[PDB]
Amino acid sequence: MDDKELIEYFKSQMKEDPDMASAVAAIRTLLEFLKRDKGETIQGLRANLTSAIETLCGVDSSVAVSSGGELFLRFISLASLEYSDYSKCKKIMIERGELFLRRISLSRNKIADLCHTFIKDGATILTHAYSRVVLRVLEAAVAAKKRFSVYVTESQPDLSGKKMAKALCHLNVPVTVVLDAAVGYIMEKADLVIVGAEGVVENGGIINKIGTNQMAVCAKAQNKPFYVVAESFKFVRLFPLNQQDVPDKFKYKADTLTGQDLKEEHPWVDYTAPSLITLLFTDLGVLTPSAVSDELIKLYL
Amino acid sequence: MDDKELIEYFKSQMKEDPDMASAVAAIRTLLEFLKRDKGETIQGLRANLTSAIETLCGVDSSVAVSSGGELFLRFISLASLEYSDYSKCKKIMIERGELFLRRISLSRNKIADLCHTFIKDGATILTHAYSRVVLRVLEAAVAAKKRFSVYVTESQPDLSGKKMAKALCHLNVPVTVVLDAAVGYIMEKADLVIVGAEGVVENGGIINKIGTNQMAVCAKAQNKPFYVVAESFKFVRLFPLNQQDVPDKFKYKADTLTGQDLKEEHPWVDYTAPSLITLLFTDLGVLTPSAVSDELIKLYL
Amino acid sequence: FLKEAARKRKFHVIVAECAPFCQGHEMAVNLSKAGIETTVMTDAAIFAVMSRVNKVIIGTKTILANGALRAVTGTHTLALAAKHHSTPLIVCAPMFKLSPQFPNEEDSFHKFVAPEEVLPFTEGDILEKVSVHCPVFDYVPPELITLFISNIGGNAPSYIYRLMSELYHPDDHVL
């Protein structure tokens, strides 16, 4: 299909299900592109899919979209490595893509089921920004007859923390919204920290909404546990060394892409090193950060 | 002087000189109250001054006002210890109070002269919120023909960081405003951190605008120097053990004084431990935090 | 200090050579003449051997107003290695080595001797495009120092300011 139809399909997929993740919607759109493809060669299909992936990344600059695109590319490469015939390869690609969509539609339930048992009764949970996975985990914890309090950061400038607070109030949970600057003031109250992730880098660290790195540093200072919940399709083969090593296309939004009220075009994501992360709750289970790299090393090579 | 006239005099003193610190204005108002006092005994004067200090602290909840009031109380006590006759005591009190005002009117110049030599040429300085002392230090550094870049946090919710950025732009200094959440993202760029202080506690730590504690923690994580500039009248005899040990009258503003959009009445100040502070630049010179306690141990007893 | 201690006590001393001026070698010879079990090693082995070192005792050239040190080169690395293992670091320096100058800047801290000590002149044309630097002194921040032993006793680095005020006048800091 054409680029305009691709963008329209991706946006409609996002709009129909608000709870659908951006990476999942991108993967479904890529599968639709594969179904609608007309080429009869693996190289042409790969080139077309790469064009589709870069179009989608231009539409949405989140790390999740890029990681989903790379996962789909590796999926078609693995399918091609098995069978040389292109027709049978495409048939198997379509079937396994449908199975892949069905399987990754259930990642959040598995993550919640695995993670809700880590929330001690009568505990305080500190959260940064909005995250559907964290919301599902807290829903599961509430449904298990657990009482807990929640502190949520405002998460400037989009104020997604207030949206998360509304969502948690819908579940009848005591939720208090704090300023970002107040994180270091409030860490002494929180028993544990639970945050989402826009992408899990090779070393096991995460790339998340701006302000997560300082939350992790403050938690490490006070020896509080730091838990990350993220699905497997958010795994990406990136190895940043510092905050400036993160690619610029992820820091600054799609529409966005001196010394006097410059504001340096405030970044939207930052990188948290794996040493500041206690555990990850993926649909593959509960993992240490060092496990994440394994899932990539076995995936490639 | 009655309470209403005291409040009017304090507010007028603040209004006439915008650059005048709140503690200095409070001390000048206390000296005016001493001059206008009609009592003929030390204990009555002490009680009246305590009531005046309580009124001023009700007007302004900053730690600086309370520390200035306590300093004035200790000053009148020291004057009363030497002299038994109340008339000579009051005369000497008035003269030494005038000298005290004249001396503490020059604290910022001394602080700037001492601190501007610590800013290396071609360096980056990270600052939190607005501070007249930091502004004077940067003015002195600029006047010494030094080129440097400045990052200033927004300092929600009053956005005093933008005011500080405008003030620095007046001095033709490259200044960039960052979000509070971005502090941990930007620390790798800053060569040093310079912040003011609303009060210096006994142990050498500081009580400052909310967000300073996490800045100090992030600086300690990356081994960046952390410098505080504060005058001597901001020294307080307080020993908080954690963030909740800070008195509530300082956290919440004068006009300000569950589990569902509560926000817990966001605090305005937090406590930074002395272990996160490299040096202090007071009008008494360049000090380690451990020196601060000395200045109090010799002041009393 | 070590020779006085060795009269009644038995202990093992490890001396870093402090290249390029390998004065530590001499320090190892004299300590060997006193019967002290001594070991010489290059500055590259400081971190490797620090794991088995109980105490660190060093001299200094200058003690700054905030308790920092202007010591021989490689002392900052030794202090960092000691801080990693939480090994105490003791500075045996007399009173006259205390200087009221803060380490603000002044671009006059390090003393750069001829690069002949680091890279010999007989290297050849390789020297016409290579920048060789040979600093003599290292700046040790006060956070890595545990104790100062002077003729007046033992002090913490946090008390050095007081020893400033009773030795020098603030108006005489800048001559």
Side-chain angles (χ1 to χ4, degrees):
Chain A
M1 56 168 128
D2 59 285
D3 291 59
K4 173 64 58 52
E5 223 183 7
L6 208 180
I7 297 176
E8 284 182 5
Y9 188 86
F10 178 56
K11 279 177 146 293
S12 69
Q13 200 81 25
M14 288 281 332
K15 175 131 47 61
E16 292 322 296
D17 189 15
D19 318 308
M20 185 165 297
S22 287
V24 159
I27 281 174
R28 303 190 57 167
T29 305
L30 285 184
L31 196 65
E32 183 60 38
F33 183 93
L34 194 97
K35 290 177 175 181
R36 289 195 194 179
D37 192 62
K38 257 69 175 185
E40 328 103 304
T41 39
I42 182 57
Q43 52 267 14
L45 171 71
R46 174 166 306 128
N48 296 353
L49 264 188
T50 294
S51 190
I53 284 163
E54 58 77 18
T55 298
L56 282 183
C57 278
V59 160
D60 202 301
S61 72
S62 60
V63 203
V65 170
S66 172
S67 48
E70 300 292 334
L71 222 59
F72 202 84
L73 225 60
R74 186 54 185 167
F75 155 79
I76 77 162
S77 180
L78 286 175
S80 170
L81 257 45
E82 265 191 46
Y83 325 143
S84 268
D85 193 10
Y86 182 81
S87 186
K88 156 168 259 283
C89 209
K90 203 161 200 164
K91 300 290 268 292
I92 294 326
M93 261 190 280
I94 292 167
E95 269 56 359
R96 297 211 280 221
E98 289 168 2
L99 183 130
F100 179 61
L101 264 54
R102 292 203 346 261
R103 144 83 204 192
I104 70 173
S105 288
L106 312 179
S107 48
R108 280 211 290 257
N109 301 1
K110 311 199 179 206
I111 288 171
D113 295 354
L114 282 148
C115 184
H116 91 91
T117 89
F118 277 80
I119 294 159
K120 185 191 61 210
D121 193 54
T124 323
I125 301 163
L126 179 54
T127 315
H128 179 68
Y130 179 65
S131 175
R132 190 67 189 76
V133 193
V134 181
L135 204 68
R136 194 81 62 112
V137 168
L138 297 182
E139 283 178 26
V142 163
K145 308 311 156 206
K146 283 173 169 187
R147 281 160 290 179
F148 53 90
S149 39
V150 185
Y151 285 110
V152 192
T153 72
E154 285 199 331
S155 196
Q156 286 261 344
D158 64 349
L159 301 187
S160 53
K162 300 187 180 180
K163 167 185 182 179
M164 173 99 177
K166 301 302 168 292
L168 267 160
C169 264
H170 201 299
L171 319 163
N172 325 62
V173 190
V175 44
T176 325
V177 186
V178 317
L179 303 169
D180 307 332
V183 158
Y185 162 86
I186 215 80
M187 180 88 22
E188 60 166 56
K189 293 190 207 175
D191 283 289
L192 70 145
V193 185
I194 301 183
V195 291
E198 311 209 7
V200 194
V201 298
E202 242 274 359
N203 47 71
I206 62 165
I207 290 176
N208 204 34
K209 172 66 166 295
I210 186 75
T212 307
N213 175 67
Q214 85 196 8
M215 176 160 305
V217 168
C218 287
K220 189 71 181 172
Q222 306 208 2
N223 213 345
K224 308 287 185 166
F226 195 83
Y227 296 137
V228 189
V229 285
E231 305 102 319
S232 50
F233 52 76
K234 279 165 173 169
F235 287 16
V236 64
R237 262 222 152 178
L238 282 202
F239 220 116
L241 302 173
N242 45 45
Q243 310 297 331
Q244 287 279 332
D245 219 38
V246 177
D248 292 1
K249 47 159 169 175
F250 301 140
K251 296 175 186 164
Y252 318 117
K253 275 190 166 182
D255 61 287
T256 286
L257 300 158
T258 47
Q260 272 151 347
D261 285 356
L262 169 62
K263 299 202 136 254
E264 57 92 53
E265 196 35 68
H266 320 108
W268 281 82
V269 296
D270 51 27
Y271 157 75
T272 295
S275 39
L276 311 175
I277 298 176
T278 305
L279 286 176
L280 288 130
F281 303 100
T282 72
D283 51 12
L284 312 171
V286 185
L287 308 171
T288 62
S290 57
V292 161
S293 175
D294 200 346
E295 303 316 305
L296 291 167
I297 286 177
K298 298 187 298 244
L299 176 69
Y300 301 89
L301 191 268
Chain B
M1 202 180 334
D2 58 283
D3 291 57
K4 181 259 306 161
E5 234 171 297
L6 207 86
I7 296 177
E8 282 183 1
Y9 189 83
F10 179 56
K11 292 220 304 298
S12 71
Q13 269 263 299
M14 288 284 329
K15 175 142 48 58
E16 294 313 307
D17 189 15
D19 318 308
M20 161 162 321
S22 290
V24 159
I27 288 176
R28 299 186 53 167
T29 296
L30 286 185
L31 196 69
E32 183 60 38
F33 182 90
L34 169 55
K35 289 178 176 180
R36 287 192 191 174
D37 191 62
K38 257 68 174 186
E40 239 305 351
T41 345
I42 180 56
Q43 59 265 16
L45 170 71
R46 175 166 305 128
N48 295 355
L49 265 186
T50 292
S51 189
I53 287 161
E54 280 330 286
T55 306
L56 286 183
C57 279
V59 160
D60 203 301
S61 72
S62 60
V63 203
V65 170
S66 172
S67 49
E70 153 189 298
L71 256 203
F72 201 84
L73 226 61
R74 185 54 186 168
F75 154 79
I76 77 162
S77 181
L78 283 174
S80 169
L81 266 39
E82 260 197 357
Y83 294 0
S84 287
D85 193 11
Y86 183 81
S87 187
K88 315 178 191 186
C89 210
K90 203 161 199 166
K91 300 286 269 295
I92 290 320
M93 261 191 284
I94 290 166
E95 269 56 359
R96 297 211 280 221
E98 289 170 1
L99 184 131
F100 179 59
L101 296 192
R102 291 204 349 260
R103 144 83 203 191
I104 71 172
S105 289
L106 313 179
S107 48
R108 279 211 290 257
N109 301 1
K110 311 200 179 206
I111 288 170
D113 295 355
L114 282 148
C115 184
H116 91 91
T117 88
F118 277 80
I119 294 158
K120 186 190 61 210
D121 193 54
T124 322
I125 301 164
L126 179 54
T127 315
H128 179 68
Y130 179 65
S131 175
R132 190 66 189 76
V133 193
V134 182
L135 204 68
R136 194 81 62 112
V137 168
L138 297 181
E139 282 178 26
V142 163
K145 303 309 173 287
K146 284 173 168 186
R147 281 159 291 183
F148 53 90
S149 39
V150 185
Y151 285 111
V152 191
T153 71
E154 282 198 331
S155 196
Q156 286 261 344
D158 64 349
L159 301 187
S160 53
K162 302 187 180 180
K163 166 185 182 179
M164 174 99 177
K166 291 186 178 185
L168 267 161
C169 259
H170 193 303
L171 318 163
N172 299 89
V173 191
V175 46
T176 323
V177 189
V178 317
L179 303 169
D180 306 333
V183 158
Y185 162 86
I186 215 80
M187 182 87 18
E188 60 166 57
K189 291 190 200 172
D191 282 290
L192 70 145
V193 185
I194 301 183
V195 291
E198 311 209 7
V200 194
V201 298
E202 241 271 5
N203 47 71
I206 62 165
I207 290 177
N208 204 33
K209 171 66 166 295
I210 186 75
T212 307
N213 175 66
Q214 85 196 8
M215 176 159 306
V217 168
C218 287
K220 189 71 181 172
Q222 307 208 2
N223 214 356
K224 308 288 185 166
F226 195 83
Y227 296 137
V228 189
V229 285
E231 305 102 319
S232 50
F233 52 76
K234 279 165 172 169
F235 287 15
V236 208
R237 212 105 203 277
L238 286 197
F239 219 115
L241 302 173
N242 46 48
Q243 310 297 331
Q244 282 282 332
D245 219 38
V246 176
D248 292 2
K249 47 159 169 176
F250 301 139
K251 296 175 184 164
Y252 317 117
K253 273 184 148 44
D255 62 287
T256 282
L257 298 156
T258 47
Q260 32 209 3
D261 288 355
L262 169 68
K263 296 184 143 283
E264 245 170 34
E265 195 36 67
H266 322 275
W268 280 82
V269 296
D270 51 28
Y271 157 75
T272 295
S275 39
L276 311 175
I277 298 176
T278 305
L279 286 176
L280 288 130
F281 303 100
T282 72
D283 51 12
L284 312 171
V286 185
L287 308 171
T288 62
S290 57
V292 161
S293 174
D294 202 353
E295 303 316 306
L296 293 164
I297 286 177
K298 271 143 57 219
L299 175 68
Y300 308 86
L301 181 272
Chain C
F1 189 89
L2 290 181
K3 285 191 184 192
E4 185 68 40
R7 269 181 255 285
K8 266 70 169 192
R9 220 135 286 182
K10 233 79 171 189
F11 51 94
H12 173 44
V13 185
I14 301 170
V15 191
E17 71 187 3
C18 191
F21 313 95
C22 294
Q23 318 241 63
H25 296 178
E26 295 111 53
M27 172 79 132
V29 173
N30 302 342
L31 292 181
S32 193
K33 281 164 187 158
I36 312 177
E37 170 204 346
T38 171
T39 280
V40 202
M41 38 141 270
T42 73
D43 311 52
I46 284 167
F47 182 79
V49 186
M50 190 62 81
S51 322
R52 312 312 202 245
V53 154
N54 302 147
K55 198 158 283 154
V56 161
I57 300 169
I58 62 174
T60 196
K61 181 90 168 175
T62 316
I63 304 178
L64 307 176
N66 67 338
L69 288 195
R70 180 213 310 261
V72 295
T73 198
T75 298
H76 188 199
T77 309
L78 209 153
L80 283 171
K83 191 57 181 296
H84 192 244
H85 297 96
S86 283
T87 298
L89 192 128
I90 301 184
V91 189
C92 296
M95 226 65 255
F96 59 82
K97 284 183 174 164
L98 265 73
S99 159
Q101 306 306 60
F102 269 98
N104 42 85
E105 228 76 74
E106 301 150 286
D107 249 344
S108 63
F109 194 92
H110 309 276
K111 169 194 189 203
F112 295 94
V113 288
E116 176 82 56
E117 329 285 344
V118 167
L119 208 40
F121 193 80
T122 67
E123 279 314 296
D125 38 6
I126 213 55
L127 297 177
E128 85 175 302
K129 304 255 145 224
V130 161
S131 318
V132 193
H133 303 292
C134 187
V136 161
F137 296 124
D138 230 339
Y139 167 80
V140 189
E143 307 101 50
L144 317 169
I145 299 142
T146 302
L147 196 76
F148 281 104
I149 291 188
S150 57
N151 40 285
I152 70 165
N155 282 284
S158 53
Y159 199 53
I160 291 292
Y161 76 101
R162 177 66 195 191
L163 308 188
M164 270 326 122
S165 66
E166 65 198 21
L167 279 192
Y168 311 106
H169 198 272
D171 296 3
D172 303 336
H173 283 187
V174 173
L175 282 176

